[model samples]
Target: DSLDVKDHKLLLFQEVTGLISTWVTSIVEEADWDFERALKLFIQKNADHEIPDLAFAKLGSHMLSKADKRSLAVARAELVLEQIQQ
Candidate 1:
C-alpha cells in the first residue's frame, strides 16, 4: 500500500510538472526568450491553478535554462539562425 501510494503521488507530480512546462514553453515563445517576465506572466495567468509559487519558480527556471541552452545551440549551428529568428 505504501509503495502504491508513493507511485501515485509521483505520477501526479509528473503530470503537474508537465502541464507547467507546457505553459512555460508557451510563455518563452511568446515573450521572445524573456524567461523571468514569462514566469511572472504565467503565474498571473494561472493564479487559480493552485500549485505553490516555489514549485512554479523551480520548474520555470529549469525550463528557461533548457531554452537558453537550446537557443545557444541553434545560434551556433550552421545555416539555421535565420530560420530560428522567424
Candidate 2:
C-alpha cells in the first residue's frame, strides 16, 4: 500500500468523486438496515468525501452469519478503516 502518497496516487488515478449513492443504497438495503446512522457516521469521517461510508461499511453489521454477505461488506469497511488508521 502507498504511504504518505495517497493524495498523489489518487490524483494520478482516474478518480470517481461523488457520493457513492448506488453502492451505499445497496449496502443499506442488503443489510436490511436504514441509512440515517450510517450516513451520519460517514459524513462524520469523510468531511472531504474522499471515501464516505468508509466506516458505515465497517460497523454496519452486528450479527455475523456465514450466509450473510452484509457481514463481509461491513467487515471490508472495517478493514478499510483499519488500513487508514495504520
Candidate 3:
C-alpha cells in the first residue's frame, strides 16, 4: 500500500520471453554464482503485494506448437513463480 507513491507515476513495462538464467546455466556451470537467485529477480518483487504475472506464458503457445510441450511450458512458468514465492 505504501507503493501508492508510484500510483501517480507513469509506468512502462515489458515482458521477457526467456529464462536467461536457466539458459546460461545450461550452457555454463560452476560459475560461482546463483542463477536461481538472479532468476528470482526477474519478477516484480518490489510490488507491495504478491501477484502472479506471466512474462512468457503466452509465448509458449507461439514458440512450442506441440500441445504437450506448450502445456508443460505454461505449467513450468507457473511453477517458477510458485518457487519464487518461497
Candidate 4:
C-alpha cells in the first residue's frame, strides 16, 4: 500500500494497470503462462509508439514472475511513476 502513493501522481494511471492486468491474464491463460512470450506480444503491440509503455509493462511482467498480484501491481505502478518522472 505504501508503494502506491507514488502511483497516484503518475501520467499513466489505472489504464496502465488495466492494460497490464488484461494482457497478463490473457497471456497466462491462453499462452500457458509464458512470460517471455507475453513480453514479446507487448513489444510487438506497442512497436509503433515512439515511447512504448512496455517499459513499465516489462517491469510488471518481471515482478509477476517473482511475486504475487498485489506486489506486481504496486511495483508496476511505482516503476511507471519513476519512468514518467525521468
Evaluated at residue 60, the lDDT of candidate 2 is: 28
Residue 3 shift from truth in candidate 4, angstroms: 25
Which should have the higher TM-score, number 1 or number 2? 1
Best by lDDT: 4
Name the runs in model 3 displaced over 4 angstroms.
Answer: 1-65
Local accuracy of candidate 2 as per-residue lDDT tens digits, 3-23: 445334332111111223454
What lDDT does candidate 2 reach at residue 31?
Answer: 35
- Please list the residue runs of candidate 4 whose C-alpha ends up more than 4 Å from where it truly belongs after superposition: 1-19, 48-86
Over the stretch 1-86, how does candidate 1's per-residue lDDT look in tens digits?
A: 36676445333332333334444456545655543344444445545644433333333233255444333322322223333345
Better of 2 and 3 by lDDT: 2
Q: How many residue pairs clash in each candidate?
A: 0, 1, 0, 0
Reference-based TM-score, model 1: 0.31
Steric clash pairs (candidate 1):
none
lDDT of 3: 0.33
lDDT of 3 by residue, 1-85 (tens): 2344322110101112232233324312332233344234333331322322332234333224444433454355456656766
Better of 1 and 3 by TM-score: 1
Worst 10 residues of 4 by lDDT: 6-15
TM-scores for every candidate against the unseen true structure = 0.31, 0.28, 0.27, 0.30
Task: State the TM-score for model 3.
Answer: 0.27
The candidate 3 region of ten consecutive residues with least summed lDDT is 7-16
